[PDB]
Amino acid sequence: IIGGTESKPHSRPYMAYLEIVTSNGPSKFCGGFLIRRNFVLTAAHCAGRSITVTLGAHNITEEEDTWQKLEVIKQFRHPKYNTSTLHHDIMLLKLKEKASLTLAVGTLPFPSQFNFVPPGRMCRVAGWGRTGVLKPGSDTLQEVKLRLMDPQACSHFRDFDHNLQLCVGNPRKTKSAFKGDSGGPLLCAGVAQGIVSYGRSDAKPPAVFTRISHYRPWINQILQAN
Known part of the structure; x- marks a missing residue:
């Protein structure tokens, strides 16, 4: 920013930090947001090999009791997502488990x-x-x-x-x-x-x-x- x-x-509280592993030059990161307990919305351009989401964070270098890090069990990229026109740059991520709704973590x-x-x-x-x-x-x-x-x-x-x-x-x-x-x-x-x-x-x-x-x-x- x-x-x-x-x-x-x-x-x-809906801010999600995404750590992404690619099939090449290591990890990259992205922002995204929690729309439901086991679903985060982000861009299709943030798709990768595996992804982890950190919920409830402020400073991503120091964990706190607010932190909740979950694994992404599946990536629903938009199928019409096109790397040329960059159209339909949206993707839904399903979490292995459901985030606990706290004041620090919300939808x-x-x-x-x-x-x-x-x-x-x-x-x-x-x-x-x-x-x-x-x-x-x-x-x-x-x-x-x-x-x-x-x-x-x-x-x-x-x-x-x-x-x-x-x-x-x-x-x-x-x-x-x-x-x-x-x-x-x-x-x-x-x-x-x-x-x-x-x-x-x-x-x-x-x-x-x-x-x-x-x-x-x-x-x-x-x-x-x-």
């Missing part, structure tokens, strides 16, 4: 098929990603307030689509989600409307987020099929 501040500890509701959040709104995003273009990731959870932009603010991104994605962050400011923040949710008025997906390598906002309302039925299909 670029140009933000450290979250108050445990003020965002977040995602929107309905008809909740279409428009340009102008200021939403918040949290994460443990890089704090600058070539800067290390953050040990502590950071968060930044960002403005939703009109579709045109993002047309520099090949294949940007209004119905499926969100254009996030004012072009005139530095604030933005960045590498490492992938998978974390965008909260608008207390509802998760997006998922950090991608942006420029130079970290200049806007960055593109997955628009979740649109995937509601699919999330639903898997959640009901378990």
Whole structure:
């Protein structure tokens, strides 16, 4: 997260930290959020060999009694997830066991098929990603307030689509989600409307987020099929 501040500890109990093992140059990490006791929502771009989720953390380098680390038993990537258009950058993760609902660890509701959040709104995003273009990731959870932009603010991104994605962050400011923040949710008025997906390598906002309302039925299909 670029140009933000450290979250108050445990003020965002749905924040999930994902450790991912790839079939190549070791682990990478991602943000994501708990939607139900054994299900986390993240980006499809955060798919890997094996994944572990740490729930209830603030500083991911020092464990606390709030910590709950669970194994991912299955990865439901979006099948239309395409590495070219980067469309459908959403994935559901099923946990081997159910997280215990505590004040430090909680669930977040995602929107309905008809909740279409428009340009102008200021939403918040949290994460443990890089704090600058070539800067290390953050040990502590950071968060930044960002403005939703009109579709045109993002047309520099090949294949940007209004119905499926969100254009996030004012072009005139530095604030933005960045590498490492992938998978974390965008909260608008207390509802998760997006998922950090991608942006420029130079970290200049806007960055593109997955628009979740649109995937509601699919999330639903898997959640009901378990």
